[PDB]
Amino acid sequence: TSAEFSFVGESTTMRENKCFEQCGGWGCGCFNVNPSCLFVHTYLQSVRKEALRV
Amino acid sequence: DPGCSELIQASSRITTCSTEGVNTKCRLSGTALIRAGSVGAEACLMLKGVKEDQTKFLKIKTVSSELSCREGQSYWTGSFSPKCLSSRRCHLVGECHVNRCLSWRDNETSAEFSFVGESTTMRENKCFEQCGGWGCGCFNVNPSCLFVHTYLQSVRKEALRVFNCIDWVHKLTLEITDFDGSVSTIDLGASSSRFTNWGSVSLSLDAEGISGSNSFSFIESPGKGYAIVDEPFSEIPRQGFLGEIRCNSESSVLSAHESCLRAPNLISYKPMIDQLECTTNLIDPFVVFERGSLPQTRNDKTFAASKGNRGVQAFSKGSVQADLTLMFDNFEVDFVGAAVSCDAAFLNLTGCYSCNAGARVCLSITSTGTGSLSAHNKDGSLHIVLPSENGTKDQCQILHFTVPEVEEEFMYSCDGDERPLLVKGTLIAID
Amino acid sequence: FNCIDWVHKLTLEITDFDGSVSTIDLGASSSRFTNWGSVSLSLDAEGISGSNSFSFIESPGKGYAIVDEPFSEIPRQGFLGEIRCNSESSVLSAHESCLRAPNLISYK
Amino acid sequence: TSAEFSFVGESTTMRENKCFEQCGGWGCGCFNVNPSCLFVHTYLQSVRKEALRV
Amino acid sequence: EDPHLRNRPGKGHNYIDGMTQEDATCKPVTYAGACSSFDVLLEKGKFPLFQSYAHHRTLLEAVHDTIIAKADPPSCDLQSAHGNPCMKEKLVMKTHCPNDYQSAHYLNNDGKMASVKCPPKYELTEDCNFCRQMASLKKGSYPLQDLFCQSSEDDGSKLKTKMKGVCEVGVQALKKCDGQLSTAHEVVPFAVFKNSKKVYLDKLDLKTEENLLPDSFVCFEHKGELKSFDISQCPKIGGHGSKKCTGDAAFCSAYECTAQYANAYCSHANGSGIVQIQVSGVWKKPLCVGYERVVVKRELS
Amino acid sequence: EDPHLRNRPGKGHNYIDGMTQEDATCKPVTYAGACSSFDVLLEKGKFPLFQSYAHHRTLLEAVHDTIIAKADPPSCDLQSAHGNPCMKEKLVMKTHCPNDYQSAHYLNNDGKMASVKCPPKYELTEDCNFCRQMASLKKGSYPLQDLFCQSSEDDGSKLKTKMKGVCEVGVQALKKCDGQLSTAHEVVPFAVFKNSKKVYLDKLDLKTEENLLPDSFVCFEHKGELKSFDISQCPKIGGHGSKKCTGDAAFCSAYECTAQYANAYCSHANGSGIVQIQVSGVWKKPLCVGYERVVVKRELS
Structure with a gap:
């Protein structure tokens, strides 16, 4: 669990943690010339109000 | 232009009204079905409350029929230029051995190049032996050694991202208008879902696609037009092939980061006792970018770029037959x-x-x-x-x-x- | 040595604006730094394929040579290049950096 | 061995225990909103008094 | 790393009403400061949101920033009778309160600093709803909410709670639920703009847009530990302000360096910028956004 | 370790006007006496170039050897702000020292000696750019660059900056530009020819010939202070000369060694003698190649 989204909790909801590379410097929003990261905390939610047993 | 071509009435099972503050409001906790409109036409959704005059509508404006591409293995590339550094030392002097330079590792900084500085680029260290004696300025009879320290840097102010498309996703840019009048422009492809204020929406029926897309590589340019190459996706980067030096991000190419990949034994050298000229025969992608610049004529379709959202598309000339699923996440609809x-x-x-x-x-x-x-x-x-x-x-x-x-x-x-x-x-x- | 590809090389004698004569050469897409800048090629043609089955021999101050056989890969007995070296000084002085064929020196 | 059916134990019969998932809330007779369970202790026994040896 | 965990830009005052036992060590907030209302905010495994957004503002610092007013009364008594303002908003809470604490401040619906306090020397219980008899007792309060603030000024008096399909959440009476109410304790965020109500949210989307702002620089005194020094006292180049300022090449490239005429040292920092919030699609500037664990009553059918 | 690198050839003086009162023990530089302007150049993990070429001269020693002149003023005054002679060349340079210094020397654009001065009792910053207030007070000049000193007679004052593609590097304005520049502190070498300016280097290709020249050896007075002894007076092998000399296998392999019957002790050095460099495709002999971390503004958009 990433520190940028650890406040959600370790529940039983289907979740996943990714990690992408962005840019660095003052061209996007940083201070060092090294590229920045992108913490992703994607969780799934139920859409249909009913389930089917195939 | 407005105008709902296909109009349907919502079912009463998912339509429950209420009353709060001399106003009759109702919410929707279900999902309706409506036919997807063509170019120009729309697909309204008539909502009824408790009587006749209280009637709401949800207009969905369709821009045009598009076929977006699904990106998979992507990588950035660009032009580079090496810089050979020579430093000849006598034999039996520090690390001037003729046997050490033979098996010299690339990731090992020699004692004669430990004063370069913060060089976090694609650097390497070789070791080519030369001659000795008093003819080339050497005190020892044994032959001398020439240390090599060549690092790669970026010389082009721009770069290109070469990717492919595994399948042509029929994307439809929809301009969904809420009941109150809120305009929201989204997009739906194949069976993808988005997130709107009124809930969620996803494309249902889809009977339009283009086969044979793995054998075509695409090139994205920052701001400028895209490109297309008639060849399969680049496998392993080897010598004499388009895409021998790749990276992962744009900054890895614009700054020549060491985290990228390159072909082994690619940087050539000219052992000239004291002189050294490191030149590489890199493949210039701008030639292919100029020879194959979008738009082009491929079969009976029109391949072009896209505005706003970055991505490749495919203009078709067929009919528009699809279905839409308007999922309401229990959102109340009021009316005065x-x-x-x-x-x-x-x-x-x-x-x-x-x-x-x-x-x-x-x-x-x-x-x-x-x-x-x-x-x-x-x-x-x-x-x-x-x-x-x-x-x-x-x-x-x-x-x-x-x-x-x-x-x-x-x-x-x-x-x-x-x-x-x-x-x-x-x-x-x-x- | 051998040759994997024939590069169209053109020896150029670039003369500067002041009058200095500089003789250089270009190949495929290589660039050389000069006084006023750098020069490189832009388009090449006329290529000869099928050169991996031929080995060339270079002589110091004498000339070149051509051999009608594939290039020597691994040294062995009964083949050209039994005992090889890294440089000319390693051959004239017999250095341990060069390789040799296993069980090549016979004995009685 | 379930806790509700502890009066049987690990007997020398063809016993088994399952736990089915059911609904909760006040509509089914519960207090917590979490789904309840269903303790089933079904055992096999002979019917007639004549057997066969195939 | 993270050299900006305890340093608070701008104001940095964690003064609480009623629990007046840390006025000596609390204003300002330095690196070697002592305050129970800030030490628990950086505890490992408690408030990850404050650890991720450390270079911002808090609740009391926002109250002392002349942008958030205090409630009346600011410190309610837990041994009252009927008509307690800190009862309905406190009993519906869920976050467990640690031991050795007496006061507990939070944010009310109107957007003011609301706090409770028991009679000495009674500490809080497990839930923090009631009180009971008494390590050592802390000299301050405990933040009940994990929220943050910044320098914003947009109005939000026309925006209300956008929780669709929710009957009654927390203490606000939204819509009338037609089905059976489902009592469940969940985590629902909230958002308070400049002089507005507690606007709850469902999917918090916060983005950071950093730029050349004066809040991206700090200043610490020299030492022939660390101290505290306001960075807003450094004027531009070729000018003269109130206090002297100096730094390195990054700090001296934009501000005037007085060399030895100052008593601090400017360094190149970051973690500031302008943080936006996703409210009704239109990206606005939050002022009191965070998370609060209340009782959510949803529809069962 | 054995301090065998303290024996500097020639004069070996390291003192400047204004401050630095340690000239009584650093004139010349020998075993006895301590000096902060030279003991920091022998510690490993800092300046490896000077450690590799420790058989020649330094910067101050090159000034005292009629090679590098003295600028006016030779010591920059940090008491007056709002710009002073010695700010544009230092603010862009990124240096670091173990603090507790007052003076610092570097190279200017003209090619002379431009240093700073810290009046007592003021301490420099962690980078040496500005100053601050107040361990021990080291009045010596901290080496800001990593250059050396050598004697040469090859003329070449008709060459400027050889770097191509950089807008404004250091303090030299090669071309104008108001667009986006890749501002980053890079390590770019530099060299000074015979009475030339600050000639920046795009690449370093040194050349050292190991012969029998006196500059290629560090033969000093045999013991069993120490200055630079001329190795040409040593007798050849199988012959006779003037004075006597001795050494190890590297020195005794070509000359003659008499052990205790010698007046000097010769030994082979690592990286000493004629030092050439590549510039404009022509080999030239500079006076001292060093490194600096100045602001390099490369072109972009």
Whole structure:
């Protein structure tokens, strides 16, 4: 669990943690010339109000 | 242009009304179905509360039929230029051994190049031996050694991202308008879902696709147009191939980061005792980018770029047959009965009949207050909604008919009382 | 040595604006730094394929040579290049950096 | 061995225990909103008094 | 790393009403400061949101920033009778309160600093709803909410709670539920703009847009530990302000360096910028956004 | 370790006007006496170039050897702000020292000696750019660059900056530009020819010939202070000369060694003698190649 989204909790909801590379410097929003990261905390939610047993 | 071509009524099982503050509101906790409109046409959603005048609509404007691409293995590339550094030292002096330079590792900084500095680029260290004696300025009889420290840096101010497409996803850019009037522009492809204020939406039926996309590599340019190459995706980067030096991000190419990949034993060298010229025969992607610049003519389709959202598309010339699933995440729909007047008049009626396009109607609505106007026919198959304000403005939308002599009576209102209205117009045969 | 690809090389004698004579050469897409800047090629043609089955021999101050056989890969007995070296000084002085064929020196 | 059916134990019969998932709330007779369970202790026994040896 | 965990830009005052036992060590907030209302905010495994957004503002710092007013009364008594403002908003809470604490401040619906306090020397219980008899007792309060603030000024008096399909959440009476109410304790965020109500949310989307702002620089005194020094006292180049300022090449490239005429040292920092919030699609500037664990009553059918 | 690198050839003086009162023990530089302007150049992990070429001269020693002149003023005054002679060349340079210094020397654009001065009792910053207030007070000049000193007679004052593609590097304005520049502190070498300016280097290709020249050896007075002894007076092998000399296998392999019957002790050095460099495709002999971390503004958009 990433520190940028650890406040959600370790529940039983289907979740996943990714990690992408962005840019660095003052061209996007940083201070060092090294590229920045992108913490992703994607969780799934139920859409249909009913389930089917195939 | 507005105008819901296909209109359907929501079911009463997922439509429960309520009353709070002399107002009758209702929410939707289900999902309806409606046919996807063509280029120009829309697909409204009639919502009924407890009586007749309380009627809401949800218009979804369709831009055009597009075929987006699905990106998979992507990588950045660009031009580079090495810089050879020579430093010859005598034999038996520090690390000037003829046997150490033979098996010298690339990731090992020698004692004669430990004063370079913060060089976090694609650097390497070789070791080529030379001659000795008093003829080349050497004190020892044994041959001398020449240390090599060449690092790669970026010289081009731009770069390119070479990627491929595993499947052509039929993406439809929809401009969904909420009940109150909130305009939201989204997109739906194949079976993808998004997130709107009224819940969620996803494309249902999809019977349009282009086969044979793995054997085509695409090139993305920052800001400029895209490109297309008639070859399969680049496998392993080897010598003499398009894409021998790749990375992962744009900054890894614009700054020549050591985290990228390159071909082994690619940087050539010219052992000239004391001189050294490190030159590489890198492949220039700008030549292919200029020879194959979008748009191009490929089979019976039109391959071009895309505005706003970055991504490749594919213009088609077929029909638009799809379905939409309007999922309502339990969102309340309120409505206030207006009491302003409005004397509308008919203008013209141009367009076509018996087709997915429709016919444009002209209405001169003259109202004295800011509100909304609702119109309907007699049998219950046509509904026209147009905004109204204080003044005289010309409105209208796209209407569908199956007769060139349209003589349908309309019933429009703006406060409660409904007055008759007759329309007319000659249409043409449009397939 | 051998040759994996024939590069169209053109020896150029670039003369500067002041009058200095500089003789260089270009190949495929290589660039050389000069006084006023750098020069490189842009388009090449006329290529000869199928050169991996031939080995060339270079002589110091004498000339070149051509051999009608594939290039020597691994040294062995009964083949050209039994005992090889890294440089000319490693051959004239017999250094341990060079390789040799296993069990090549016979004995009685 | 379930806790509700502890009066049987690990007997020398063809016993088994399952736990089915059911609904909760006040509509089914519960307090917590979490789904309840269903303790099933079904055992096999002979019917007639004549057997066969195939 | 993270050299900006305890340093608070701008104001940095964690003064609480009623629990007046840390006025000596609390204003300002330095690196070697002592305050129970800030030490628990950086505890490992408690408030990850404050650890991720450390270079911002808090609740009391926002109250002392002349942008958020205090409630009346600011410190309610837990041994009252009927008509307690800190009862309905406190009993519906869920976050467990640690031991050795007496006061507990939070945010009310109107957007003011609301706090409770028991009679000495009674500490809080497990839930923090009631009180009971008494390590050592802390000299301050405990933040009940994990929220943050910044330098914003947009109005939000026309925006209300956008929780669709929710009957009654927390203490606000939204809509009338037609089905059976489902009592469940969940985590629902909230958002308070400049002089507005507690606007709850469902999917918090916060983005950071950093730029050349004066809040991206700090200043610490020299030492022939660390101290505290306001960075807003450094004027531009070729000018003269109130206090002297100096730094390195990054700090001296934009501001005037007085060399030895100052008593601090400017360094190149970051973690500031302008943080936006996703409210009704339109990106606005939050002022009191965070998370609060309340009782959510949803529809069962 | 054995301090065998303290024996500097020639004069070996390291003192400047204004401050630095340690000239009584650093004139010349020998085993006895301590000096902060030279003991920091022998520690590993800092300046490896000077450690590799420790058989020549330094910067101050090159000034005292009629090679590098003295600028006016030779010591920059940090008491007056709002710009002073010695700010544009230092603010862009990124240096670091173990603090507790007052003076610092570097190279200017003209090619002379431009240093700073810290009046007592003021301490420099962690980078040496500005100053601050107040361990021990080291009045010596901290080496800001990593250059050396050598004697040469090859003329070449008709060459400027050889770097191509950089807008404004250091303090030299090669070309104008108001667009986006890749501002980053890079390590770019530099060299000074015979009476030339600050000639920046795009690449370093040194050349050292190991012969029998006196500059290629560090033969000093045999013991069993120490200055630079001429190795040409040593007798050849199988012959006779003037004075006597001795050494190890590297020195005794070509000359003659008499052990205790010698007046000097010769030994082989690592990286000493004629030092050439590549510039404009022509080999030239500079006077001292060093490194600096100045602001390099490369082109972009």
